[PDB]
Scaffold this active site. Structure first.
Site, PDB file in Angstrom:
ATOM      1  N   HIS A  41       0.810  -1.227   0.000  1.00 28.59           N
ATOM      2  CA  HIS A  41       0.000   0.000   0.000  1.00 28.59           C
ATOM      3  C   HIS A  41       0.840   1.272   0.000  1.00 28.59           C
ATOM      4  O   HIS A  41       0.272   2.337   0.244  1.00 28.59           O
ATOM      5  CB  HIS A  41      -0.983   0.027   1.174  1.00 28.59           C
ATOM      6  CG  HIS A  41      -0.341   0.225   2.513  1.00 28.59           C
ATOM      7  ND1 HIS A  41      -0.334  -0.758   3.481  1.00 28.59           N
ATOM      8  CD2 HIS A  41       0.311   1.285   3.051  1.00 28.59           C
ATOM      9  CE1 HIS A  41       0.287  -0.310   4.559  1.00 28.59           C
ATOM     10  NE2 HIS A  41       0.694   0.925   4.321  1.00 28.59           N
ATOM     11  N   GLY A 137       4.062   6.150   9.977  1.00 30.97           N
ATOM     12  CA  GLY A 137       5.432   6.078   9.540  1.00 30.97           C
ATOM     13  C   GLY A 137       6.091   4.748   9.803  1.00 30.97           C
ATOM     14  O   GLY A 137       7.133   4.462   9.201  1.00 30.97           O
ATOM     15  N   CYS A 139       5.141   1.641   9.052  1.00 29.18           N
ATOM     16  CA  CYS A 139       4.898   0.515   8.152  1.00 29.18           C
ATOM     17  C   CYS A 139       6.173   0.043   7.449  1.00 29.18           C
ATOM     18  O   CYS A 139       6.984   0.853   6.985  1.00 29.18           O
ATOM     19  CB  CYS A 139       3.833   0.915   7.134  1.00 29.18           C
ATOM     20  SG  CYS A 139       2.231   0.940   7.929  1.00 29.18           S
TER      21      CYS A 139
HETATM   22  C1  8I0 Z   1       1.537   2.574   7.581  1.00 31.51           C
HETATM   23  O1  8I0 Z   1       1.163   2.603   6.195  1.00 31.51           O
HETATM   24  C2  8I0 Z   1       2.552   3.642   7.835  1.00 31.51           C
HETATM   25  O2  8I0 Z   1       3.186   3.586   8.887  1.00 31.51           O
HETATM   26  N1  8I0 Z   1       2.686   4.551   6.845  1.00 31.51           N
HETATM   27  C3  8I0 Z   1       2.947   5.968   7.023  1.00 31.51           C
HETATM   28  C4  8I0 Z   1       2.391   6.703   5.832  1.00 31.51           C
HETATM   29  C5  8I0 Z   1       3.052   7.829   5.329  1.00 31.51           C
HETATM   30  C6  8I0 Z   1       2.532   8.492   4.214  1.00 31.51           C
HETATM   31  C7  8I0 Z   1       1.349   8.052   3.605  1.00 31.51           C
HETATM   32  C8  8I0 Z   1       0.689   6.928   4.110  1.00 31.51           C
HETATM   33  C9  8I0 Z   1       1.212   6.253   5.219  1.00 31.51           C
HETATM   34  C10 8I0 Z   1       0.355   2.734   8.540  1.00 31.51           C
HETATM   35  C11 8I0 Z   1       0.693   2.325   9.978  1.00 31.51           C
HETATM   36  C12 8I0 Z   1      -0.541   2.454  10.856  1.00 31.51           C
HETATM   37  C13 8I0 Z   1      -0.814   3.920  11.168  1.00 31.51           C
HETATM   38  C14 8I0 Z   1      -0.401   4.122  12.625  1.00 31.51           C
HETATM   39  N2  8I0 Z   1      -0.060   2.795  13.108  1.00 31.51           N
HETATM   40  C15 8I0 Z   1      -0.270   1.860  12.192  1.00 31.51           C
HETATM   41  O3  8I0 Z   1      -0.277   0.663  12.378  1.00 31.51           O
HETATM   42  N3  8I0 Z   1      -0.733   1.873   8.126  1.00 31.51           N
HETATM   43  C16 8I0 Z   1      -1.916   2.345   7.768  1.00 31.51           C
HETATM   44  O4  8I0 Z   1      -2.251   3.521   7.856  1.00 31.51           O
HETATM   45  C17 8I0 Z   1      -2.858   1.315   7.243  1.00 31.51           C
HETATM   46  C18 8I0 Z   1      -2.907   1.382   5.720  1.00 31.51           C
HETATM   47  C19 8I0 Z   1      -4.276   1.923   5.342  1.00 31.51           C
HETATM   48  C20 8I0 Z   1      -5.047   2.138   6.646  1.00 31.51           C
HETATM   49  N4  8I0 Z   1      -4.165   1.693   7.727  1.00 31.51           N
HETATM   50  C21 8I0 Z   1      -4.419   1.581   9.042  1.00 31.51           C
HETATM   51  O5  8I0 Z   1      -3.646   1.043   9.843  1.00 31.51           O
HETATM   52  C22 8I0 Z   1      -5.754   2.108   9.495  1.00 31.51           C
HETATM   53  N5  8I0 Z   1      -6.412   1.058  10.204  1.00 31.51           N
HETATM   54  C23 8I0 Z   1      -7.462   0.549   9.602  1.00 31.51           C
HETATM   55  O6  8I0 Z   1      -8.082   1.266   8.830  1.00 31.51           O
HETATM   56  N6  8I0 Z   1      -7.763  -0.723   9.890  1.00 31.51           N
HETATM   57  C24 8I0 Z   1      -9.079  -1.310   9.724  1.00 31.51           C
HETATM   58  C25 8I0 Z   1      -9.296  -1.469   8.225  1.00 31.51           C
HETATM   59  C26 8I0 Z   1     -10.138  -0.439  10.390  1.00 31.51           C
HETATM   60  C27 8I0 Z   1      -9.179  -2.681  10.373  1.00 31.51           C
HETATM   61  C28 8I0 Z   1      -5.714   3.342  10.386  1.00 31.51           C
HETATM   62  C29 8I0 Z   1      -5.372   2.961  11.812  1.00 31.51           C
HETATM   63  C30 8I0 Z   1      -4.737   4.367   9.828  1.00 31.51           C
HETATM   64  C31 8I0 Z   1      -7.098   3.939  10.443  1.00 31.51           C
HETATM   65  C32 8I0 Z   1      -3.922   0.462   5.040  1.00 31.51           C
HETATM   66  C33 8I0 Z   1      -3.746   0.188   3.547  1.00 31.51           C
HETATM   67  C34 8I0 Z   1      -4.838  -0.523   5.773  1.00 31.51           C
END
Ligand code: 8I0
Ligand code: 8I0
Lengths: 300, 300
Positions: A41, A137, A139
């Site tokens: 992603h 950040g 991931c």
């Molecule tokens: C991860 O991608 C990251 O650390 N990236 C930083 C970044 C910089 C610039 C642009 C995009 C990302 C990030 C790590 C999450 C965020 C904080 N702690 C974590 O574990 N992952 C991330 O944001 C994933 C990514 C989207 C949505 N997402 C999430 O973790 C969601 N959680 C959910 O939506 N989970 C459900 C689907 C409800 C079960 C939140 C927590 C950000 C809302 C992917 C593709 C799932």
């Protein structure tokens, strides 16, 4: 003596942590040999195939500290992006990709913008979440174990669940658990307590002079597993008992006897007392953990 | 989100861990530049001066992995031996020797025979012990913090106390606490709970969605410190309050308000509930710890 949650040394893994930027997304990548593994992603209910057929090599920025790496090719293996670059990592260790079973533990090297932030110890829960410490950040940080000289990469972070636990993949791309890298409704699933681990930690306790929880009683693995049910504990198999052998051997406490103690703790609680400085029965210690720590196995 | 005991990355320190053998004693040494720091009882109610005036250079074996280092000179600075060798460590980082105050935390890289075994997080207790995880062979492992790119070496292990805690020195040789590297009667001294740290961890709790412990009540730092006495808690200074500022700022909970919560926890207990997955009030988290982890500060 003493007993701590102990990470593996994080040094062979720090050498592989690079930054991966694509568009408006920056996360962490794992550079091993000439291949940079990161979560897919970074290209973002999407359709990553359409989203990838779709980018070019030059769209992917790869900092390795102050050195910009050129991608010369890319593929998608399940939920991880494999960015082939033109430089093999001089600091590449002996390493494996492996996939862990629930119950087992590993070390997580939380990185941000490619720089290591910290290292702590986790377990693959039953419900296949890991109770981690991940911020925006993070991931692309990896979980891993070290075996003599070999790093077993077993985890990449992708996402956090609404309950504040985390989900991710083995390094071959595949989600531990029913989760998916799509922002849609996903629930962890009820967690349970890793019983084989709790005993191992009680053995870690005896080895360290902690005896407040023991008793003369024994039990049969059957009727123990009746109470491990009610306390929402993983059934104990005979195979778990076999594993506990070495620890049961060291201490002269029969695995079944220890179960009768764990039984009684569950049925009474700890009554103001701690074990190994916890007021909870701890379960993110495998038996191998205890033996490593209660015998000091190293890594060159 | 999430919150773990998090070690610093151990990589800059692994590069400095060598084996030091002299006679029938093998322990760990810290090779920085061309100097190898190890605990002086590697030469062993002794009189180390007489015991050192006493050895020659060639008596000291120094493995650096599979590379034998020749000592070209030695001195004794307090309880550490400084063995000058003929090779500067190519992997020498930017580093400090510092001495920590009780309350503060650091990362310990448990080594045996010169090889890193694990890394975990400790605190300098009030009584100047550290609750560690040290076995025979561990002596000469170092505690340390990482600041941007700088390793602050603040600990070397020497010895374990009959209660199973550990004692040691700053890297300039000097014992934290009244302990001495002589096998004679030495008692830890009554430990106390690091109050400023417990609040910081409660702030770590609020930042992570844990609110079960809060209340509308406030208290004055004076009458809080009356109950921190009885529960054998470090008095809280206004200086501790100032430090807690940032965390109190982030959450909109006044430091004093948080004290009224900690008060009530002490006066009632946690009543079956946990905070950040503990049934104990945790105190080996400095405020700086929480801010690092609840904001993800890294290190290149
Ligand atoms: C991860 O991608 C990251 O650390 N990236 C930083 C970044 C910089 C610039 C642009 C995009 C990302 C990030 C790590 C999450 C965020 C904080 N702690 C974590 O574990 N992952 C991330 O944001 C994933 C990514 C989207 C949505 N997402 C999430 O973790 C969601 N959680 C959910 O939506 N989970 C459900 C689907 C409800 C079960 C939140 C927590 C950000 C809302 C992917 C593709 C799932
Ligand atoms: C440390 O020297 C070590 O790890 N060395 C290995 C070694 C190899 C070959 C020959 C000698 C040593 C060792 C680490 C201890 C042992 C296990 N965990 C530890 O913390 N230190 C050590 O043995 C010190 C050293 C002697 C005695 N000693 C001890 O820690 C004592 N403890 C005490 O005696 N403490 C009192 C004085 C009671 C308060 C025990 C635990 C070994 C008995 C020095 C010079 C104090």
């Amino acid at each position: 003596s003493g007993f701590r949650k102990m990470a593996f040394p994080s040094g062979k893994v720090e050498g592989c942590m690079v930054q991966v930027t694509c568009g408006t997304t920056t996360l962490n990548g794992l550079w091993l040999d000439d291949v940079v593994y990161c979560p897919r992603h970074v290209i973002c209910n999407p359709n990553y195939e359409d989203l990838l057929i779709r980018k070019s090599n030059h769209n992917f920025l790869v900092q390795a500290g102050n050195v910009q790496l050129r991608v010369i090719g890319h593929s998608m293996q399940n939920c991880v992006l494999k960015l082939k670059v033109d430089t093999a990592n001089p600091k590449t260790p002996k390493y494996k990709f492996v996939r862990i079973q629930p119950g087992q533990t590993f070390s997580v090297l939380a990185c941000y913008n490619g720089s290591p932030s910290g290292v702590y110890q986790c377990a693959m829960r039953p419900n296949f979440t890991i109770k981690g410490s991940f911020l925006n950040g993070s991931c692309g940080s990896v979980g891993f174990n070290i075996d003599y000289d070999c790093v077993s990469f077993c985890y990449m972070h992708h996402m956090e669940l609404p309950t504040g636990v985390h989900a991710g993949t083995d390094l071959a791309g595949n989600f531990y658990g029913p989760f998916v890298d799509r922002q849609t409704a996903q629930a962890a699933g009820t967690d349970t307590t890793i019983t084989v681990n709790v005993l191992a930690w009680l053995y870690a306790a005896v080895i360290n002079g902690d005896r407040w929880f023991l008793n003369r009683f024994t039990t049969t693995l059957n009727d123990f597993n009746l109470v491990a049910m009610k306390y929402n504990y993983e059934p104990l198999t005979q195979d778990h008992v076999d594993i506990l052998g070495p620890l049961s051997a060291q201490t002269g406490i029969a695995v079944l006897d220890m179960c009768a103690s764990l039984k009684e703790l569950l049925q009474n609680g700890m009554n103001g007392r701690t074990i190994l400085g916890s007021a909870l029965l701890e379960d993110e210690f495998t038996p191998f953990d205890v033996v490593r720590q209660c015998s000091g196995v190293t890594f060159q």
